[PDB]
Amino acid sequence: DLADLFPGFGSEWINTSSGRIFARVGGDGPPLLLLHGFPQTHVMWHRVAPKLAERFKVIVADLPGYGWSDMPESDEQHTPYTKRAMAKQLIEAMEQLGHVHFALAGHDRGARVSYRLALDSPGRLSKLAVLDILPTYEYWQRMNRAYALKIYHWSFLAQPAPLPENLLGGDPDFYVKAKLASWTRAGDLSAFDPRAVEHYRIAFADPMRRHVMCEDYRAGAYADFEHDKIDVEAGNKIPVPMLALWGASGIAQSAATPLDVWRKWASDVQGAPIESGHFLPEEAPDQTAEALVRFFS
Amino acid sequence: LADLFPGFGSEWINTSSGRIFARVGGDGPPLLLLHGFPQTHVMWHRVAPKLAERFKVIVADLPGYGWSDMPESDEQHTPYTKRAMAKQLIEAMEQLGHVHFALAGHDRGARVSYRLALDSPGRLSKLAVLDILPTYEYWQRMNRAYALKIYHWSFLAQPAPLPENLLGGDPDFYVKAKLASWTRAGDLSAFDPRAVEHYRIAFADPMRRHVMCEDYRAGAYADFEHDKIDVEAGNKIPVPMLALWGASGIAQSAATPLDVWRKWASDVQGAPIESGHFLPEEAPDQTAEALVRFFSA
Known part of the structure; x- marks a missing residue:
């Protein structure tokens, strides 16, 4: 049914005060937490995690409310799905494993948790890697016609419930596949492992999971x-x-220019473009892995 | 579908780009009324009787909308550009012998209207636009607050078939959500239920929904x-x-709408009306009086 894309990795249900976090855990050495984004799950790391696990204890976690992690009840302020709250929940998850100082790489929504984590509790991180994001503030401050069309889902998925939930329910399989394909270099699903796509599609098929994503946005x-x-x-x-x-x-x-932007937000940042669309660890797994291995070492 | 224009005739006007449907009533100088999204010509059913006491009132379905024919679109969405719609409605009016006429438009229809006045000012005696700024101005003001407010400008403009596929799961929900969300009260109480049925029926047709996206x-x-x-x-x-x-x-x-319109128009007057977006249905008397006074001066 759902393919195990991390041969050799354990599977951990990490209890937190806000619900369980699901994680594949592999390797040994310094702890390294990998956080996925939208509309994906932890399995998006499946082609880069084995490389990292040669040198690190790699924890490949589903974000709160995503994938197989529990979905804490939201509120009028969407508090549990704020990146500040998700970061606190993942800090607690890592503490359950005895990791109070870890490396962190995040992609998309996970990268937003990751830099928020770094701003709120920098003591928790040795090094931080963000994949294909700018700070949320920068996207909204740069909002113009061009960007409104390109990241339309930022305003669409943030509409009050149940408007995006109902629309997403009109064709969830199409939407998750359209989001995956449109944001690659190829513009189709050929860069993805079809078994990973099935993980993403099955997660997106759940109306409760889709609501969580809208709460996130x-x-x-x-x-x-x-x-x-x-x-x-x-x-x-x-x-x-x-x-x-x-x-x-x-x-x-x-x-x-993302490096120029990130210097305003970080005092010690290096950067490199990857010949890829948005989904760096799947479209360019060797380049992404090499850059992450080099940086975290 | 109820007849909401008692005594008005019905006209199917052939043009080079397809037939325009219109209800026609009254006598006197010709006055073309244009609806917008997600409505049809029947949005004028409360104000057109008052107008018909003084004017030959032509209440037209926009090209592609309501009962008008739907030209096939293309990669540049040409038939549903306001420039093309304006030319088609000029053709429609010529078919009735109206080469110089007054024009009042709402929403998309108002966008046709001011584009008509820019391209072919000699066709218009006077022009009224209801609850719009020029399209350029909306895009130029697309910051975070406005992108959240009119998200649909960037959602419906997504490449086909993305909005089409999401709208198709529950069309009734979206057309009623749009009507309700843009009113003062935030519900459907301002609308005649017979009018709502016209709007819902138009919106239930997937080809009609495609046209609306092409418009956007x-x-x-x-x-x-x-x-x-x-x-x-x-x-x-x-x-x-x-x-x-x-x-x-x-x-x-x-x-502030008048300040903006004074940049686009050399002879513009303006008034607010206590109402939501749907002026002729939420505030029929006030709207009808403002139009009668403007067009008879």
């Missing part, structure tokens, strides 16, 4: 933006060494 | 481009113009 339009805004206005920078990777045809390159 | 695609691209050429060239509408907007409508959410 609702937080992204409101509370996440305000948390970022406070750090900009306070001049708060990420003091953790960080690597910013982005796809040459991805989402973050069209807004602004 | 044109709105994101060619319409914007056409407007952009005119603003940067300082081309102003020379036709005497009335700009009416709802105090709680869409146009006032981006800017």
Whole structure:
């Protein structure tokens, strides 16, 4: 049914005060947490995790409310799906494993948890890697006609419930596949492992999972933006060494030169383009893995 | 479907781009009324009787909308650009012997209307636009707050078949959500239920929904481009113009409407109406009086 894409990795249900976090755990050495984004699950790391697990204890976690992680009940402020709250929940998850100081790589929504984590609790991180994002504040501050059309889902999925939930329910299989295909370099699903796509499609088939994603984007339009805004206005920078990777045809390159942007947010950032669309660890697994191995070593 | 224009005739007007449906009533100078999204000509059913006491009132379905034919679109969404719609409605009016006429438009119909007045000002005696700013102005003001407010401008402009596939799961929900969300009260109480049925029935047709997306695609691209050429060239509408907007409508959410319209029009007057977006249904008497006074001066 659902293919195990991490041969040799354990499977852990990590209890937190907000619900369980699901994780594949492999390797040995320093702890490294890998966080996926939308509309994916942890399995998006399946082609880069074995490379990392040669040198690290790799924890490949489903975000709160995504994949097989539990879905905490939201509220009017979408609090559990704010990146601040997800970061606190993942900090607690890592503590359950005895990891209070870990490396972190995130992609898409997971990268937003990751830099928020770095801003709120930089002591928790040795090094941070963000894949194909700019800070949420930067997307909203750069909002223009061009960007409104390109990341339309940022305003569409943030509409009040049940509007996106009902529309997404009109053709969920089409939408998740359209999102995967449209954001690759190829523009189709040929860069993905078909068994990974099945993981993404089955997760997107659940109306409750789709609601969580809308809660995520609702937080992204409101509370996440305000948390970022406070750090900009306070001049708060990420003091953790960080690597910013982005796809040459991805989402973050069209807004602004991502390395130039991230320097305003981080005091120690290196960056490199990857010949890829948005889904760096699947479209360019060897280049993405090499850059992550080099940086975290 | 109820007849909401008692005593009005029905006309099927052949044009080169397809038939235009219109209800025709009254006597006196010709006055073309144009609806918008997601409505049909029947949105004027409360105001057109009052207008018909003084004017020959032509209440037309936009090209592609309601009962008008649907030209096949193309990669540039040409038949549903306001420029093309304006030319087609000029043709329609010529078929009735109206080469100089008054024009009042709402929503998309108002976009046809001001584009008509820019392209062919000599066809218009006077022009009224209801609860819009020019398309250029909406895009130029597309920051975070406005992208969340009129998300549908960037959702419906997504490449086919994405909006089409999502709309098709529960069409009734979306058309009623759009009607309800843009009113003052936020429900359907301002609308005649017989009118709602007209709107719901039009929206239940997948080809009609495709046309609406094509309209919105044109709105994101060619319409914007056409407007952009005119603003940067300082081309102003020379036709005497009335700009009416709802105090709680869409146009006032981006800017103070009269200030904007004075940039686009050399002879524009304006009034707010206590109403949501759907002025002729939410505030029929106030709307009808403002139009009768403007068009008979």
